[PDB]
Amino acid sequence: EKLIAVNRVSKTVKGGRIFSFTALTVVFGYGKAREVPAAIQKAMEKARRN
Amino acid sequence: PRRRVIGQRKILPDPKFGSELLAKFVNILMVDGKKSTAESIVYSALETLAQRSGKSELEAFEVALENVRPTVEVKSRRVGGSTYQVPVEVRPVRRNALAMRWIVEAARKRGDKSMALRLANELSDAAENKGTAVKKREDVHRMANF
Amino acid sequence: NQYYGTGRRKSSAARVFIKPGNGKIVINQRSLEQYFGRETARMVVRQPLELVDMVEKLDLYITVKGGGISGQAGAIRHGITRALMEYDESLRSELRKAGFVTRDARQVERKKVGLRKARRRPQFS
Amino acid sequence: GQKVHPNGIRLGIVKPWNSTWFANTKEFADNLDSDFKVRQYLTKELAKASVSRIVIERPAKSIRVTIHTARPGIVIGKKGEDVEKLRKVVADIAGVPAQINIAEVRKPELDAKLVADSITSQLERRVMFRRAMKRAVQNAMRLGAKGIKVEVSGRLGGAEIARTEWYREGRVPLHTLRADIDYNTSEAHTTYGVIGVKVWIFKGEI
Amino acid sequence: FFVNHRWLGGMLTNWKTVRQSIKRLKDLTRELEKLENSLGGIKDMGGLPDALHEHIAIKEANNLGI
Amino acid sequence: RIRIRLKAFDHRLIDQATAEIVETAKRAQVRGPIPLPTRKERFTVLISPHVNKDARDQYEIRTHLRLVDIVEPTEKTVDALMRLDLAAGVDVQISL
Amino acid sequence: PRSLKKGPFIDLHLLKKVEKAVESGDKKPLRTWSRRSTIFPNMIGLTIAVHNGRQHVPVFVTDEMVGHKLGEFAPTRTYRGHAA
Amino acid sequence: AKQSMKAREVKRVALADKYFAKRAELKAIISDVNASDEDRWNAVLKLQTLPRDSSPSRQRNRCRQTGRPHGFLRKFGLSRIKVREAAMRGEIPGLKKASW
Amino acid sequence: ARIAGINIPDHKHAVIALTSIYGVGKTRSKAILAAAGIAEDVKISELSEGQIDTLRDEVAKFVVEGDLRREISMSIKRLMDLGCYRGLRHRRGLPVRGQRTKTNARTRKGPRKPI
RNA sequence: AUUGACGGGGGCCCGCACAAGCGGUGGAGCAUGUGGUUUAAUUCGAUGCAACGCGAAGAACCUUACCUGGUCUUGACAUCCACGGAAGUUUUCAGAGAUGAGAAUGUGCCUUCGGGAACCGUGAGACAGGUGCUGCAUGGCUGUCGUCAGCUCGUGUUGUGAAAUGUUGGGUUAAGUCCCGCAACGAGCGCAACCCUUAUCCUUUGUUGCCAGCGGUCCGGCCGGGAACUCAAAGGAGACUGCCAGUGAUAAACUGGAGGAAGGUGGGGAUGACGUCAAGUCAUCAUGGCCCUUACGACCAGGGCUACACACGUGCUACAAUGGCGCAUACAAAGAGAAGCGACCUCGCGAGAGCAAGCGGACCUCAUAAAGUGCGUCGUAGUCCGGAUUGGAGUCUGCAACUCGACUCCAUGAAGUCGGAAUCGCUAGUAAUCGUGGAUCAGAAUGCCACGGUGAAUACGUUCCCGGGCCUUGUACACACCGCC
Ligand SMILES: CN(C)[C@@H]1C(O)=C(C(N)=O)C(=O)[C@@]2(O)C(O)=C3C(=O)c4c(O)cccc4[C@@](C)(O)[C@H]3C[C@@H]12
Ligand SMILES: [K+]
Ligand SMILES: [K+]
Ligand SMILES: [K+]
Ligand SMILES: [K+]
Ligand SMILES: [K+]
Ligand SMILES: [K+]
Ligand SMILES: [K+]
Ligand SMILES: [K+]
Ligand SMILES: [K+]
Ligand SMILES: [K+]
Ligand SMILES: [K+]
Ligand SMILES: [K+]
Ligand SMILES: [Mg+2]
Ligand SMILES: [Mg+2]
Ligand SMILES: [Mg+2]
Ligand SMILES: [Mg+2]
Ligand SMILES: [Mg+2]
Ligand SMILES: [Mg+2]
Ligand SMILES: [Mg+2]
Ligand SMILES: [Mg+2]
Ligand SMILES: [Mg+2]
Ligand SMILES: [Mg+2]
Ligand SMILES: [Mg+2]
Ligand SMILES: [Mg+2]
Ligand SMILES: [Mg+2]
Ligand SMILES: [Mg+2]
Ligand SMILES: [Mg+2]
Ligand SMILES: [Mg+2]
Ligand SMILES: [Mg+2]
Ligand SMILES: [Mg+2]
Ligand SMILES: [Mg+2]
Ligand SMILES: [Mg+2]
Ligand SMILES: [Mg+2]
Ligand SMILES: [Mg+2]
Ligand SMILES: [Mg+2]
Ligand SMILES: [Mg+2]
Ligand SMILES: [Mg+2]
Ligand SMILES: [Mg+2]
Ligand SMILES: [Mg+2]
Ligand SMILES: [Mg+2]
Ligand SMILES: [Mg+2]
Ligand SMILES: [Mg+2]
Ligand SMILES: [Mg+2]
């Protein structure tokens, strides 16, 4: 299994900025989550089906 | 208010005569919850307004109210930035309310010694179109210009 | 027999005993006129008997404690209304319509932290 | 916003008091101070013995202390050796005849104080804060908590800027008064200062 | 087996979640009718079925190969 | 005649304690338990360490109070009532 | 003021100094911190240097001062006007 | 509170207890309607000479946990802050949040 | 009419009229009239010249008017000459009885003096 | 192009936000906090809303952190070590006291007569000590938007992607409240409910509370009694849009009606989502780092925190006749009390004093409710309004009321005749007004927290002002319009 990059993305809210993480994995899969570990899992899950 | 669901509270009739009109009048005269004080003023004033009229206390009260009750008054409305003074019809409850308020306000700044006498004199003057209460009604009518 | 009713208003509670008679009213071992100075108080007490037309058909023995002059007058009215309904249950509809059967549950609202009173807030600059 | 103490708001609804004695004003303050010194002593002495809660009762001219413990064997000791030491010190502190009773905490992973103490112990051993928090949550939900929240606040990982992090699983309905919310706290004294831990464990209504 | 009212977007692509409403209907009057007017003809299906306006249902069927 | 006043911070606790007494003594005619007025002692505290004067907590201790009177009491009664054991957190007070 | 039933207050240390000063003859100033002590008749003619927080202010005792406290004659605050 | 400030209070409580009977004896003479003016005067001068810290009015109630000299509650012997902390942990018997 | 070298009001009740005298308040006024044997609610106009003589004798038992002003002047002068704290407060025209001066003190200081 | 935020863009809504009202503040005197100035010191902190009767629920000494001066150096507060002392207790002198120096009396307890420790020195030196600094290193606790109705996640699906959907829409609600539709299906935290209190009833128990009917009286529930009633406090019952009609989408719900003590969240409280402001607090406490150590630590007396050309905030008392004064006389609730509450009686004009019951309280005490009502008087005056200020004389607490207490008596009798621009609170047992209690506390409230009494006016409405919610739209904003330029 092959993670390629991890990007930190941001959306702005009333309070400030919600930072979140993206994970690109071929085994392709593009995951999104609040944490890096969760993002990679979602990516790897998607890369199996796709 | 915005939700505008305001009903009205059960006014008890005045104990002596049995008028809700006069009960409201006592409430408008009353200060600091001292209803017993206000009742004695109103009834003292009415007794004098009877012996200086030759009629029932409430008949003479009615005559005074007749001459003070407004029919029309102005209301401010924001249209264009510069705020107009717009005449509208006064509904009959507000007519009685303003008249009583004006009579009480008139009587309070009169120069007689007791409030009972000040009030009797205001109602006497009102019942023949003279004092400051009827001047307020006339002033309101002058302003009432859309 | 005696017909009984408890009445309450603000912090007053009244005990009202009614028997066939001719318009005696005793409140705390005193006449109505002696006990209550105010006409409003006396009117309030007599309102139920005036409504049902039994002012000089009934003797009232009353005791009352707590609250003030208006509280106690209101408590007595409620008590008389209940005693009447024990005497004659047909009177309920008329007494209900007059608003005498309701226990007025308005009480003093508590003082609250940061307020001068129950609702009066300190002045803001 | 600030939140009401979950234990405090449920006292008498679904949570018992940890001190159950009667006193008039005369003895009230003195009893609170003796209770304070008893709990201070026992918390010091039984730091390694997984103490969740110390219930104090004062029947007559006496003190009865119940220690809720996940490791009862070492509190009690060797045919009641360690417990007899504690009793004699508790009687000295309290100034009345003492009785120490021992209640076992089965399922220490569902005990908010022990979970909080477990996390703060790990943080003082320089364990990564996220891993301590996640394991606590996972353990509680495995043994049948209807929910758990864990919060850690301070200089996490020795960061200069302090921050709060929290994780929840399941239900933690704090506004529901009949909810059995077990709540407790702990402090990790690290080389970069204090890290506070808060644990909420929900175990069902009533 | 049949879906004869509204096809719920994710009926089969999100089968795992719609199964929890199957379990919910099975255990259990208005929450009933709302489920028996929807998931009442997939309650014994047990998994991804054999074969089947319904652009959504066809699209889900193509994703899985049903 | 033995007046027994019970006090407790918990009404469930005191009602159990009185039930233990009256049971023991009714095996002597007792009177009660009489529920005397609960004392509500109240405390208002500032909850901030500094300033914020309008932020307070209000706390209460309720002291529940019962009276039981034991009449024509026997040697068994004075004994049975002392070999009795009430729960902790219930203050008991006898008067002869 | 102090109840008449209790008599006038004087610090014992000051009383003993004054009594010794009076019997010895005309003294240097008596140094005291007892601002709260009442001035008695036997103090008339003595200088009592009374503390004001930072220095002992000389107070030559007269008959009119009798019954006052010593601190009345040694002001503790310094004020000479704003905007000087 | 500083350790010294807590130590000052311990000294005050000790001295007050040591001299309680003596102080009451002297104040009884000074309050006595029928005492000699010599006896009252001697008693006034004697009461001065005892340590000032033997007067109970010199004691400031302090929180028994922190030594805080403000916000004290006599019932609990604690400051407002420590009362709250103990109250919420269920350590003050009977005490709960009040509403009415 | 004339008591203590001042004109007392003739229309007023005796108890109120005597309080025109400096040194006579309500308590002393009532005591004067009790001693003189005159009712409080009698007007000064209604009293006989013998009754005004009795009031003059009763008023002569107190320090009033010019004698009292002299006593009060001398008491303040004593303090100011003593150089006591109260004396210094009198000289400076500030409150003498421990009142705050950061604010208020307007009775002693008078109207505000703009900076 | 996306998510926000913002718009003197649009649509729809809400809140004493405005309007309608009632009473205030702003003027006066005083109380109190703050700024400033002053000072030896006027200890430190809180600063737009969200600091300014705030931390402080109570600074004469103490408290006390500050100043002046006098003093101590392993030490006021711990542990360890060694040696010599039982510890205590009575007292004298010098000293402002800290403290220094003497006198005198104790000599126990455990005790394998090996002893040790309860407790005192004194001598080391590891240490103690710090209300010293950093709240922008932190924990904990708190304010705030706001009790506003929001804030999210999993999985699915959509988009290259930031992200979106769900959460929007049609209705409806106090409410993302509920219904219906819908590429979403579900879920979590919030809403609501569960908790406390108040309004009605029932059961149980019946003294210290109760007195309807008896019997008796000293006419006082006072006494025998009674267990009815008030009440006490445990347990129950009761309200659900449940019933009826109309309306509505065959919905949710809405409008009205019945019954009912109560009606649509019945009234009030507790309860404060994700987050925001490097918001507040290193002086409650705790704590990283830094810093001081014969001093930034410690002890003492006296002073200061109470200063006063002045400015601001929060209050109290007024300016009177709906009132003042005098006499007479009704009706509360809630609470506190043993180094405490203190009756009766006697003394005092009074604050109080003396004597001395009762009460750890439904029993005794605080403890007079006041406004009210009746009668009388004053007669519109700077007054019989107001009660500041000052003189004199006292009382009490307290080692001690000079700086700097509260209260009393006699005397004094200021400003003030309803307050400019502006501005605040309140929608009902509310506002307004009237007393009552409590915490802190030796003493020291006009503050704070709580309790009853009397008891209003007004709301057409949502155009406008302030804060906020939802949808949509433009943006060169993202330190987010207090922006960018
Ligand atoms: C004085 N005033 C109350 C200021 C203010 O208005 C603030 C605000 N958010 O409105 C602050 O943050 C303000 O209150 C505040 O907290 C400030 C700070 O915390 C700091 C700190 O800690 C260190 C350096 C600088 C600052 C600061 C400039 O941001 C401070 C400004 C403060
Ligand atoms: K005069
Ligand atoms: K001053
Ligand atoms: K903080
Ligand atoms: K999603
Ligand atoms: K620090
Ligand atoms: K004030
Ligand atoms: K003001
Ligand atoms: K006057
Ligand atoms: K003083
Ligand atoms: K004003
Ligand atoms: K006090
Ligand atoms: K917009
Ligand atoms: Mg009130
Ligand atoms: Mg305030
Ligand atoms: Mg004096
Ligand atoms: Mg410390
Ligand atoms: Mg003190
Ligand atoms: Mg003062
Ligand atoms: Mg308005
Ligand atoms: Mg003003
Ligand atoms: Mg600081
Ligand atoms: Mg300051
Ligand atoms: Mg700061
Ligand atoms: Mg700011
Ligand atoms: Mg001081
Ligand atoms: Mg000496
Ligand atoms: Mg901060
Ligand atoms: Mg949203
Ligand atoms: Mg919801
Ligand atoms: Mg939807
Ligand atoms: Mg209805
Ligand atoms: Mg809720
Ligand atoms: Mg800051
Ligand atoms: Mg000092
Ligand atoms: Mg100050
Ligand atoms: Mg007057
Ligand atoms: Mg008290
Ligand atoms: Mg009590
Ligand atoms: Mg006077
Ligand atoms: Mg003038
Ligand atoms: Mg409202
Ligand atoms: Mg008041
Ligand atoms: Mg909404």
PDB file of N, CA, C and O in Angstrom, chain B residues 14-15 26 29 34-44, chain C residues 38-40:
ATOM      1  N   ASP B  14     -65.130  49.749  40.861  1.00  0.00           N
ATOM      2  CA  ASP B  14     -64.860  50.519  42.065  1.00  0.00           C
ATOM      3  C   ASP B  14     -65.903  50.135  43.119  1.00  0.00           C
ATOM      4  O   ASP B  14     -67.068  49.930  42.775  1.00  0.00           O
ATOM      5  N   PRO B  15     -65.533  49.984  44.416  1.00  0.00           N
ATOM      6  CA  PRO B  15     -66.459  49.462  45.427  1.00  0.00           C
ATOM      7  C   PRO B  15     -67.721  50.281  45.707  1.00  0.00           C
ATOM      8  O   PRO B  15     -68.777  49.700  45.951  1.00  0.00           O
ATOM      9  N   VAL B  26     -59.022  55.457  39.349  1.00  0.00           N
ATOM     10  CA  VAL B  26     -58.318  55.318  40.621  1.00  0.00           C
ATOM     11  C   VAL B  26     -56.897  54.790  40.387  1.00  0.00           C
ATOM     12  O   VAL B  26     -55.946  55.307  40.969  1.00  0.00           O
ATOM     13  N   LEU B  29     -54.662  57.493  39.010  1.00  0.00           N
ATOM     14  CA  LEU B  29     -54.307  58.432  40.064  1.00  0.00           C
ATOM     15  C   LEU B  29     -53.322  57.827  41.070  1.00  0.00           C
ATOM     16  O   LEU B  29     -52.521  58.565  41.638  1.00  0.00           O
ATOM     17  N   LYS B  34     -50.571  52.590  46.493  1.00  0.00           N
ATOM     18  CA  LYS B  34     -51.385  53.085  47.603  1.00  0.00           C
ATOM     19  C   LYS B  34     -52.814  53.308  47.108  1.00  0.00           C
ATOM     20  O   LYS B  34     -53.257  54.444  46.960  1.00  0.00           O
ATOM     21  N   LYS B  35     -53.534  52.209  46.852  1.00  0.00           N
ATOM     22  CA  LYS B  35     -54.848  52.272  46.229  1.00  0.00           C
ATOM     23  C   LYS B  35     -55.875  52.916  47.158  1.00  0.00           C
ATOM     24  O   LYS B  35     -56.700  53.698  46.688  1.00  0.00           O
ATOM     25  N   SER B  36     -55.823  52.568  48.450  1.00  0.00           N
ATOM     26  CA  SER B  36     -56.735  53.090  49.459  1.00  0.00           C
ATOM     27  C   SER B  36     -56.690  54.618  49.514  1.00  0.00           C
ATOM     28  O   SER B  36     -57.740  55.252  49.600  1.00  0.00           O
ATOM     29  N   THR B  37     -55.476  55.189  49.448  1.00  0.00           N
ATOM     30  CA  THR B  37     -55.260  56.627  49.374  1.00  0.00           C
ATOM     31  C   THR B  37     -55.931  57.215  48.128  1.00  0.00           C
ATOM     32  O   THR B  37     -56.668  58.194  48.237  1.00  0.00           O
ATOM     33  N   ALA B  38     -55.658  56.617  46.958  1.00  0.00           N
ATOM     34  CA  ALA B  38     -56.192  57.077  45.683  1.00  0.00           C
ATOM     35  C   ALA B  38     -57.724  57.015  45.647  1.00  0.00           C
ATOM     36  O   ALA B  38     -58.345  57.929  45.112  1.00  0.00           O
ATOM     37  N   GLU B  39     -58.319  55.947  46.201  1.00  0.00           N
ATOM     38  CA  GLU B  39     -59.767  55.794  46.271  1.00  0.00           C
ATOM     39  C   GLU B  39     -60.417  56.930  47.061  1.00  0.00           C
ATOM     40  O   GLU B  39     -61.447  57.447  46.631  1.00  0.00           O
ATOM     41  N   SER B  40     -59.823  57.300  48.204  1.00  0.00           N
ATOM     42  CA  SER B  40     -60.350  58.363  49.050  1.00  0.00           C
ATOM     43  C   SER B  40     -60.270  59.729  48.359  1.00  0.00           C
ATOM     44  O   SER B  40     -61.140  60.566  48.589  1.00  0.00           O
ATOM     45  N   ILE B  41     -59.228  59.956  47.542  1.00  0.00           N
ATOM     46  CA  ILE B  41     -59.102  61.172  46.746  1.00  0.00           C
ATOM     47  C   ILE B  41     -60.235  61.235  45.723  1.00  0.00           C
ATOM     48  O   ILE B  41     -60.901  62.263  45.625  1.00  0.00           O
ATOM     49  N   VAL B  42     -60.410  60.149  44.955  1.00  0.00           N
ATOM     50  CA  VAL B  42     -61.384  60.093  43.872  1.00  0.00           C
ATOM     51  C   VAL B  42     -62.796  60.309  44.426  1.00  0.00           C
ATOM     52  O   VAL B  42     -63.533  61.118  43.869  1.00  0.00           O
ATOM     53  N   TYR B  43     -63.149  59.626  45.525  1.00  0.00           N
ATOM     54  CA  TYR B  43     -64.482  59.725  46.107  1.00  0.00           C
ATOM     55  C   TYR B  43     -64.721  61.094  46.751  1.00  0.00           C
ATOM     56  O   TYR B  43     -65.840  61.600  46.676  1.00  0.00           O
ATOM     57  N   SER B  44     -63.692  61.686  47.375  1.00  0.00           N
ATOM     58  CA  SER B  44     -63.766  63.056  47.871  1.00  0.00           C
ATOM     59  C   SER B  44     -63.999  64.048  46.728  1.00  0.00           C
ATOM     60  O   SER B  44     -64.811  64.961  46.876  1.00  0.00           O
TER      61      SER B  44
ATOM     62  N   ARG C  38     -61.156  48.693  54.974  1.00  0.00           N
ATOM     63  CA  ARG C  38     -61.334  49.053  53.571  1.00  0.00           C
ATOM     64  C   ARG C  38     -62.645  48.495  53.019  1.00  0.00           C
ATOM     65  O   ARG C  38     -63.009  47.361  53.327  1.00  0.00           O
ATOM     66  N   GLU C  39     -63.316  49.293  52.171  1.00  0.00           N
ATOM     67  CA  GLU C  39     -64.549  48.891  51.503  1.00  0.00           C
ATOM     68  C   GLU C  39     -64.289  47.790  50.476  1.00  0.00           C
ATOM     69  O   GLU C  39     -65.131  46.907  50.326  1.00  0.00           O
ATOM     70  N   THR C  40     -63.158  47.873  49.756  1.00  0.00           N
ATOM     71  CA  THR C  40     -62.760  46.844  48.805  1.00  0.00           C
ATOM     72  C   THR C  40     -62.651  45.482  49.487  1.00  0.00           C
ATOM     73  O   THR C  40     -63.152  44.499  48.945  1.00  0.00           O
TER      74      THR C  40
END
